[PDB]
């Protein structure tokens, strides 16, 4: 589902920053 | 203090918060600007989804920290 | 130069890339090594999703930088 993909994308973005 | 909230659509929201503010306090401030109900918001910081009842300080969210927002 | 590419499942792969490689080139190297087609890859660095048509150097991706890979 798009929601699960978006959650993964946000987790990765967040990780990659801090 | 200011924090940033970034969406996957490329928007950067800013919020004025205190370290003792709760996550729901934060989501309400997003609602005030974007119209998105808190229950449609998932906030992410340091690879973790942020939970109701906890404060920004609980997650070590400090000045000019960036949270990520995804919508249900 | 070696870079690392990690997924949220914890896997970390090593790739040999150049500063002038485009993002689509790097995705082609992941496809070559892991068999994942480029349209299934989203690459992330320093809080940005990397865009095709740009190079690694455009993002200041250097030797031993770590990129995140999310699969679509």
Give a topology summary.
The complex is a heterotrimer, with one copy of chain A (about 20 residues) and two copies of chain B (about 70 residues).
Chain A lengths: L1 H16 L1
Chain B lengths: L1 E6 L4 E5 L6 H12 L6 E5 L2 E2 L16 E6 L1
Parallel strand pairs in B: 1-5
Antiparallel strand pairs in B: 1-2, 3-4, 3-5
PDB class: protein transport
Keywords: protein-protein complex, uim and ubiquitin, protein transport
Assembly: trimeric
Which sequence of SSEs, written as H and E, runs from N to C of chain A?
A: H
Helix-strand topology string of chain B? EEHEEE
CATH class division of chain B: Alpha Beta
Total helical segments of chain A: 1
Structural class of chain A: mainly alpha
Q: What is the strand tally of chain A?
A: 0
From the alpha-carbon coordinates, what is the Rg of chain B to the nearest angstrom? Answer: 11 Å
- Sheet of most strands of chain A: none
CATH level-two architecture of chain B: Roll
Strand content of chain A: under 5%
H/I helix tally of chain B: 1
The rounded distance between the terminal residues' Cα atoms of chain B is 27 Å
Could you name the CATH topology of chain B?
Ubiquitin-like (UB roll)
Helical content band of chain A:
over 70%
Helix content of chain B: 10-25%
Biggest interface goes to:
A-B, 11 and 17 residues
What gross morphology of chain B would you assign?
A: globular
Ends distance of chain A: 27 Å
From the alpha-carbon coordinates, what is the Rg of chain A to the nearest angstrom? 8 Å
PDB class: protein transport
Keywords: protein-protein complex, uim and ubiquitin, protein transport
Assembly: trimeric
Entry title: Double sided ubiquitin binding of Hrs-UIM
């Amino acid at each position: 589902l798009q929601e699960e993909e978006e959650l993964q994308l946000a987790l990765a973005l967040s990780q990659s920053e801090a | 203090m200011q924090i940033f909230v970034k969406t996957l659509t490329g928007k950067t929201i800013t919020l004025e918060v205190e370290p003792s503010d709760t996550i729901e306090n934060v989501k309400a401030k997003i609602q005030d600007k974007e119209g998105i109900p808190p229950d449609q918001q998932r906030l992410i910081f340091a690879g973790k989804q942020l939970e109701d009842g906890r404060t920004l300080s609980d997650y070590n969210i400090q000045k000019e920290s960036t949270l990520h927002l995804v919508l249900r």
